[PDB]
């Protein structure tokens, strides 16, 4: 079921093989093959007990942060975003599954930057008033960081401030801001620096 599905997806996604990588003459698939893999995955999980699909969605994250492969991580994020854009793969479920359990504060700063760029691109995620809840977890990741980390990861880690500023500024057109206040109340009890 889910294990066999993940095995098939890994066998399909992991197309990288250095077979005789010597500088020989052994002779843009990043778009067409991506859509093909997305369609195959959608046709597979469409009839695979979609009620538990959200669980498998979290299982997807199991493969997300597996490889280091920053270009491949960006490609995977882009193709999964496109697959979400096809109406399938509800955005709230996938963002909730990807945000937690793989945060790795400063452990994968590149993966952090790509993940925050992705959630910024998918920050639409239109839903009911139960969306700002995810924001809470975001602040949690900002809480597990003293502001004395490294002079290099400043603008790199600034993606968090960027996405939160975008959320709260477009709240005039994204989501009611008083709910944002009552959500951030979980960080401060009326004044906590």
Using CB under 8 A as the criterion, which residues of the chain lie in contact with another protein when the complex forms? 15-30, 67-72, 75, 106-111, 149-156
Nearer residue to another protein within complex by CB, 29 or 51: 29
Q: How far is the CB of 3 from another protein (least distance, A)?
A: 23
User: What's the token pair of residue 93?
Assistant: 């479920």
Q: How far is the CB of 66 from another protein (least distance, A)?
A: 11
Radius of gyration of the chain (CA): 19
Nearer residue to another protein within complex by CB, 109 or 171: 109
Question: What angle in degrees, to the nearest 10, is found between the helix axes of 2-13 and 53-64?
Answer: 40
DSSP 8-state assignment for residue 183: H
Nearer residue to another protein within complex by CB, 18 or 126: 18
CA distance to 21, 75, 108, 144, per residue, from 104 (Å)? 32, 20, 6, 10
Q: How far is the CB of 8 from another protein (least distance, A)?
A: 19
Nearer residue to another protein within complex by CB, 98 or 174: 98
Which residues contact residue 36 at a Cβ distance below 8 angstroms, ignoring those fewer than 6 apart? none
Q: How far is the CB of 67 from another protein (least distance, A)?
A: 7
């Amino acid at each position: 079921m889910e294990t066999q599905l993940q095995s098939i997806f890994e066998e399909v996604v992991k197309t990288e093989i250095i077979e005789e990588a010597f500088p020989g003459m052994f002779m843009e698939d990043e778009k067409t093959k991506l859509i093909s893999c997305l369609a195959a995955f959608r046709q597979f999980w469409s009839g695979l007990s979609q009620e538990s699909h959200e669980q498998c969605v979290q299982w997807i994250v199991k493969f997300i942060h597996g490889q280091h492969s920053p270009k491949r991580i960006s490609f995977l994020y882009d193709c999964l975003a496109m697959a979400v854009e096809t109406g399938l793969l509800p955005p709230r479920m996938v963002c909730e599954s990807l945000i937690n359990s793989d945060s790795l504060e400063w452990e994968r700063t590149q993966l952090w930057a790509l993940t925050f760029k992705l959630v910024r691109k998918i920050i639409g995620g239109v839903d009911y008033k139960g969306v700002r809840d995810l924001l809470k977890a975001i602040l949690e990741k900002i809480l597990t960081i003293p502001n004395t980390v490294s002079s290099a990861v400043v603008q790199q880690l600034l993606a968090a401030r960027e996405v939160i500023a975008y959320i709260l500024e477009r709240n005039a057109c994204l989501l009611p801001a008083y709910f944002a206040v009552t959500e951030i109340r979980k960080l401060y009890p009326e004044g906590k620096l």
